Design a protein around this ligand. Structure first.
Ligand SMILES: Cc1c(Cl)c(OCC(=O)N2CCN(C)CC2)nc2sc(C(=O)NC3CC3)c(N)c12
Ligand SMILES: CC(=O)OCC[N+](C)(C)C
Lengths: 236, 56, 338, 274, 218
């Protein structure tokens, strides 16, 4: 098994400080890279912090630098996020993901479970726009969804970096396609990807009743990571 | 016990002595034809420029 | 009756020799008297992979022509990226004495082996991060000299107890054993169709098998010492063998006999590795005299020297697209050439 | 007359340059020859190289005519650099002496306890000590005293008269290393014998070690005794050799320290032949 | 600088480079020895005296020093194929049975031929040998009843222990022609209390000589 479970949530009045702990079991934790991703009650996915293997490189979002901090304790295999001087724009549920990198690897392959924190009343960042928000579907049909960036995602190395994510209602997201063409592990053959440069598309063939939810696209050309608003799916 | 080994050896020789044979020149010409057919796509004797060499 | 069986064997061998002489009309050189020479081949060291700490004993290319396994007796099996001189996995081995390594054609497993009579299979695509040992095949009574995959579920090895084996990874058994040699078998190479392979031992012979049933089909004897390397012609109808009498020989299959011999008066050392190109016009052979030579594979004339190694070159492999040749020597280094 | 001296100077310069370049390229590409022991010889092999080109050719420029063609615009910088690099050479010899003594006297624990960082620290210390010990006084005795005692027709040490400074500098940079090196080598010779109980091992070691010490001391003695002498007789011409003599060991010590290894000499054969 | 997502890969590459370097540094602190012999040479007698199919590796530490003993007598094949894997070892421990009046071709003659072959091998042209002459008791008992001249006809001299053993030792020692390497000799009894000390002293001397030659000072 692989298990990531988080703790340290609840309710705090504005201005306070807290610490979040994400505990891991089932894999070589010291050889991975940990991320943090948060989700507002109505909005989509947003990025918080990143710490690497060996804790050499640490990255933060623009709306977080200075306030929050990240750490890891790999002998006791637990990841930590310290939050100080909060605000009402932090009421959200937080996540814990792993991002092993090498030639042929698969980042963002496992997503944790998420801890809920609420607070009472008191220019080169690449923009990515998902066009359609609601798409009614019928089982057995074929549906194509789109994602358009602002910069060309085809590097010189012959690679392009767009990842697709699926989120069932009330669970954590799972990785579908990495690098615009590669089908991940544990996912069926139905899903496929295509596109060029900026205009990227994902195709689902013979859609079943288990694939309802919301779909997202992510870029990995340069930091900070930027998601899309997501596209929802509904039957009938 | 060497009798069984000798019997196995002679049986193997008899089994391998019943194979058909093409002529030597025919096979030499076949190798020549295969070598001369696939000459273009060999990046070792027809050196490839600095534009499509991955190790450049 | 032993004398009677000896006389019968002598008669059979005389018949085989007479048939072989009869079917031989003209040699390959006369047919290849017209083709133009390929000219001197200029090859410069492009990448110099520098990671090990002891003498490299084996290599093996991947299937995608980019990844590369390297095994050396510093206890290490490390896989590289040729294009960007990077290391993607380092594997510490249970036994430090290693003489073989294989990279599965699907890229999922690797294999290793040596003097400790056990072929270890290492996984690569685990869901827990690191790479771990999946099986330790152990039925041999002597050292392993070569190990080649067939698919994900089976493996073929050759060991110094004068025998060869086809295994079954899932179970652990020894699905078939090939015997019939006289001395230490030290090389192995698989034809493209993965249906039959040739092995050459230290008794100056090379015999060709069939993997389904184990019956030896042909025995080739031209040499005068041990054979330490074997490779196939790309079309699976000829193979090249490298001995320790300073000569390497190109043998046929349907004509059932020897076609060409390659040797030069200046050369007296022993071959440790032989390979071809993609088309089948050049032969690349690594010597004990600290370099490599390129032979016109249809003219026997030397056509360049791959030099630059400070000690004996052991492993030698060309890629699956003909884009580079990787040579690895006891200098702990590993070089790429175009 | 002049052709002979310019020829001998050019010969020494070229041989020194090629020798040290070969030593460094050799240590760079033989895989095994790379060791902790060989890096104190990767320092020296460069320091003389500078002397192998600068002082070599510029003393040749002033060696002959007799008048500093350049005045005090470059004389201060050249002289300071010359004295600094030579002292660096002596310090590299000293750290090699330490390295050998510790690799022979305590052979089990020592060769592994130290990492590359300690060796680099010792190298940098040997360089910085020489830099601080010679460059500042030489370059800034002008402002320290307020006058330029050196006239424009020749180049020499500004503080030649101040007895304390001349003693201090010379006594350090020559007479501390002599006693330290001789003591350490006599102990190495004592402890090189085989406790287990046809020349012996001790015989070969003592022959080589006496060679090195005697060569260095003969090469650097007379200059460092005349320096004590002045603080009043002017060879005016005789001591011209002194400089030349003192440059000679910047030309031979690659052979006295990397042609006896026999692992380096094989690589030399491979490099020259191929 | 033009790198995109390959920056991580390079971090991992340097991490594993550091692991390799540290493992090499930690694994250069162990002495490597190779144990050879002849048939019934008594090499099983001294392997058990050390207290903590294929190659049999024995591990022990003495006086704060790692040791590794690689018995390879279990290999039944041509020797000239796997000896070169054992280059760059520190020492070869050669055991010879002093019982030298039997047939397997006198056993001593097989021992001398093997010692000559292994001492003039091209790979071990400069690798030292620790020589153990076992069964110094049994030989002492046997020498009284039989003459040494049966083994070496050329011999002339006393039939006592103290000289016959010396003659055998010298005849063995006379097989080396390199000027660098050396043979260290000892005559262990069937059950002596401590002869790991002899191995310790021999390996210390080998390390000192190697250091001296490496520094160039030799
Ligand atoms: C060592 C040295 C010194 Cl200390 C020096 O001047 C220092 C000195 O003794 N004095 C006393 C007399 N005052 C007038 C001037 C300062 N001047 C030269 S010239 C030269 C050379 O080697 N060759 C000369 C022919 C070009 C030297 N080795 C040398
Ligand atoms: C450093 C020292 O005292 O003498 C160096 C003189 N030189 C430059 C001739 C060698």
């Amino acid at each position: 098994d692989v298990q990531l479970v988080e703790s340290g949530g609840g309710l705090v009045q504005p201005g306070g400080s807290r610490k979040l702990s994400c505990s891991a079991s089932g894999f070589a934790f010291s050889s991975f890279g940990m991320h943090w991703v948060r989700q507002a009650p109505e909005k989509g996915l947003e990025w918080v912090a990143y710490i690497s293997s060996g804790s050499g490189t640490i990255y933060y979002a623009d709306t977080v630098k200075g306030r929050f901090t990240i750490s890891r304790d790999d002998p006791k295999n637990t990841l930590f996020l310290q939050m100080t001087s909060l605000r009402s724009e932090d009421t959200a549920m937080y996540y814990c993901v792993r991002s092993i990198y090498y030639y042929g690897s698969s980042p963002f392959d496992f997503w944790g479970q998420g801890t809920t924190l609420t607070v009472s009343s008191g220019g080169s960042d690449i923009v990515m726009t998902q066009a359609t928000s609601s798409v009614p579907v019928t089982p057995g049909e074929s549906v194509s969804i789109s994602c358009r960036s602002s910069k060309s995602l085809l590097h010189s190395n012959g690679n392009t970096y767009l990842y697709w994510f699926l989120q069932r209602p009330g669970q954590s997201p799972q990785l579908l396609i990495y690098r615009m063409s590669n089908l991940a592990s544990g996912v069926p053959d139905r899903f496929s990807g295509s596109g060029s440069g900026t205009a990227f598309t994902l195709t689902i063939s013979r859609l079943e009743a288990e694939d309802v939810g919301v779909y997202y696209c992510m870029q990995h050309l340069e930091y900070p990571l930027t998601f899309g608003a997501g596209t929802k799916l509904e039957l009938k | 016990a060497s009798i069984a080994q000798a019997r196995k050896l002679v049986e193997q020789l008899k089994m391998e002595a019943n194979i058909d044979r093409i002529k030597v020149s025919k096979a030499a010409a076949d190798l020549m034809a295969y070598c001369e057919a696939h000459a273009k796509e060999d990046p070792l004797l027809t050196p490839v420029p600095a534009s499509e060499n991955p190790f450049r | 009756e032993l004398d009677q069986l000896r006389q019968e064997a002598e008669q059979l061998k005389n018949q085989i020799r007479d048939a072989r002489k009869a079917c031989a009309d003209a040699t390959l050189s006369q047919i290849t008297n017209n083709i133009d020479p390929v000219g001197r081949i200029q090859m410069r060291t492009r990448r110099t992979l520098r990671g090990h700490l002891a003498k490299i004993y084996a290599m093996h290319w991947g299937t995608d022509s980019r990844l590369l396994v390297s095994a050396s007796q510093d206890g290490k099996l490390i896989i590289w990226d040729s294009y960007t001189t990077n290391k993607v996995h380092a594997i510490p081995l249970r036994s430090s004495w290693v003489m073989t390594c294989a990279y599965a054609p699907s890229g999922n497993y690797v294999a290793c082996g040596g003097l400790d009579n056990i072929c270890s299979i290492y996984n690569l695509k685990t869901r827990e991060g690191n790479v771990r040992v999946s099986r330790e095949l152990a039925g041999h009574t002597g050292y392993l000299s070569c190990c080649r995959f067939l698919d994900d579920n089976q493996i073929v090895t050759s060991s110094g107890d004068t025998t060869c084996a086809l295994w079954d990874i899932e179970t652990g058994q020894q699905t078939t054993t090939f015997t019939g040699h006289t001395g230490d078998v030290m090389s192995l190479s698989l034809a493209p169709d993965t249906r039959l392979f040739v092995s050459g031992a230290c008794d100056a012979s090379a015999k060709l098998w069939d993997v389904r049933e184990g019956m030896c089909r042909q025995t080739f004897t031209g040499h005068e010492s041990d054979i330490n390397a074997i490779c196939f012609f790309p079309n699976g109808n000829a193979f090249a063998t490298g001995s320790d009498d300073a000569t390497c020989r190109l043998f046929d299959l349907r004509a059932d006999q020897e076609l060409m011999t390659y040797s030069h008066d200046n050369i007296i050392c022993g071959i440790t590795s032989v390979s071809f190109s993609k088309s089948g016009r050049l032969l690349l052979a690594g010597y004990d005299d600290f370099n490599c030579n390129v032979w016109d594979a249809l003219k026997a004339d030397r056509a360049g020297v791959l030099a630059g190694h400070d000690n004996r070159v052991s492993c030698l492999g060309v890629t699956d697209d003909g884009m580079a040749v990787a040579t690895g020597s006891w200098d702990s280094f590993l070089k790429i050439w175009n | 007359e002049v052709v002979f001296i310019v020829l001998v100077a050019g010969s020494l310069s070229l041989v020194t340059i090629i020798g040290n370049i070969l030593v460094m390229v050799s240590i760079k590409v033989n895989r095994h020859l790379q060791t902790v022991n060989n890096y104190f010889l990767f320092s020296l092999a460069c320091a003389d190289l500078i002397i192998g080109v600068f002082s070599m050719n510029l003393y040749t420029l002033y060696t002959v005519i007799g008048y500093w063609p350049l005045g005090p615009v470059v004389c201060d910088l050249w002289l300071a650099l010359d004295y600094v690099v030579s002292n660096a050479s002596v310090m590299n010899l000293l750290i090699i002496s330490f390295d050998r003594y510790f690799c022979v006297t305590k052979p089990l624990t020592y060769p592994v306890k130290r990492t590359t960082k300690m060796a680099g620290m010792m190298i940098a210390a040997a360089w910085v000590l020489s830099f601080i010990l010679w460059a500042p006084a030489i370059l800034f005795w002008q402002f320290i005293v307020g006058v330029r005692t050196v006239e424009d027709g020749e180049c020499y040490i500004q503080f030649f008269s101040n007895a304390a400074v001349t003693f201090g500098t010379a006594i350090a940079a020559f007479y501390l290393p002599v006693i330290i090196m001789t003591v350490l080598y006599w102990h190495i010779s004592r402890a090189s014998k085989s406790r287990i109980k046809p020349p012996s091992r001790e015989k070969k070691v003592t022959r080589t070690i006496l060679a090195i010490l005697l060569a260095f001391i003969i090469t650097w003695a007379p200059y460092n005794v005349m320096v004590l002498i002045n603080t009043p007789c002017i060879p005016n011409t005789v001591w011209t050799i002194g400089y030349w003599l003192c440059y000679i060991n910047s030309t031979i010590n690659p052979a006295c320290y990397a042609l006896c290894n026999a692992t380096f000499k094989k690589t030399f054969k491979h490099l020259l032949m191929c | 600088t033009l790198s995109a997502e390959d920056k991580a890969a390079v971090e991992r590459s340097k991490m594993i480079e550091k692991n390799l370097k540290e493992d090499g540094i930690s694994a250069a602190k162990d002495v490597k020895l190779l144990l050879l012999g002849a048939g019934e040479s008594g090499k099983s007698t001294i392997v058990k005296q050390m207290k903590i199919t294929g190659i049999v590796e024995t591990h022990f530490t003495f006086k704060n020093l790692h040791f590794r003993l690689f018995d390879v007598g279990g290999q039944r094949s041509e020797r000239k194929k796997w000896i070169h894997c054992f280059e760059d070892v520190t020492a070869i421990i050669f055991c010879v049975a002093l019982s030298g009046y039997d047939q397997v071709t006198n056993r001593m003659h097989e021992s001398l031929m093997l010692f000559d072959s292994i001492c003039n091998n091209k790979f071990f042209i400069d690798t030292s040998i620790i020589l153990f002459l076992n069964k110094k008791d049994l030989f002492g008992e046997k020498i009284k009843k039989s003459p040494l001249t049966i083994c070496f006809p050329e011999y002339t001299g006393p039939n006592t222990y103290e000289d016959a053993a010396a003659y055998i030792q010298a005849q063995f020692e006379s097989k080396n022609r390199s000027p660098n390497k050396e043979i260290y000799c000892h005559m262990t009894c069937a059950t002596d209390t401590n002869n790991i000390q002899v191995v310790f002293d021999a390996v210390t001397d080998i390390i000192i000589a190697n250091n001296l030659r490496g520094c160039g000072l030799y």
